[PDB]
Amino acid sequence: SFHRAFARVVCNYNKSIEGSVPWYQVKREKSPFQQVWDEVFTPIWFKLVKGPYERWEYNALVARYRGMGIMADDAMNDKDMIVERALDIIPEDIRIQRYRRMMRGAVLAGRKLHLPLELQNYDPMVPYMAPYIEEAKFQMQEEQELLAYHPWDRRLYTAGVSGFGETSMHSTFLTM
């Protein structure tokens, strides 16, 4: 049987790379060719194209946030699961101000108005969600590894759920 031979090859290979250091954790020296490219192309490209374009986009983004009176981390959409899991655990004082800022922004945007300049002198790029995003990613990675390492077989279209993995009832068209 060829599947048995293939299974042994996979087992032996994976056993031979256990404990390997990830590529990013290796101390890597650039090749003599990438160093030349960085010496010539990268400086000129930054001065003439990348630097000005990205400053132009960044400064516009800061202005847009300041006009709405929101922070950058407010702009995250909770349809993303990491954001939703992080928002479950944020403390109440952070939550209250986040909601108020987001509500004011939508009112301003909907009515085509901008925040008064008196209230615009703040840094919008303060990363207040970072501790909770990292905790949420850790929780999700543990669940991924210890509980979702195989494609599981379940009885199909039973109890309001397709049986293909989703956990909410009536959350697909074929489960109406």
């Binding site: 279209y157 039973t158 109890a159 309001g160 009832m169 009536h170």
Partner: protein
């Protein structure tokens, strides 16, 4: 659905969305009952047709004999009309 008393459920587990109709036909069995059966894979699957054959047809025919008199009267009407039609045609046309 059945009566409200019949479909009143004892358990608090919610009715699955795919069994709505199944649980609207629930019955409240009074006094209990013992149900027994055997898988068709361990039974004769055609003998019951033969065993029940004569009684099935006897009771079918005795019930259908109730329509004997009505059918004869309608048939008697069918014959009179058919031969009343022939005589009329001949009288009006034949010489």
């Amino acid at each position: 659905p059945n009566t409200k008393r019949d479909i009143r459920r004892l358990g608090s587990y919610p009715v699955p969305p795919e069994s709505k109709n199944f649980w609207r036909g629930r019955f409240q069995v009074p006094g209990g009952q013992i149900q027994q059966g055997v898988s068709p894979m361990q039974q004769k699957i055609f003998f019951q047709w033969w065993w029940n054959l004569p009684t099935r047809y006897f009771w079918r025919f005795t019930k259908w004999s109730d329509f004997l008199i009505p059918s004869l009267m309608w048939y008697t009407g069918f014959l009179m009309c058919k031969n009343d039609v022939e005589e009329g045609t001949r009288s009006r046309y034949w010489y």
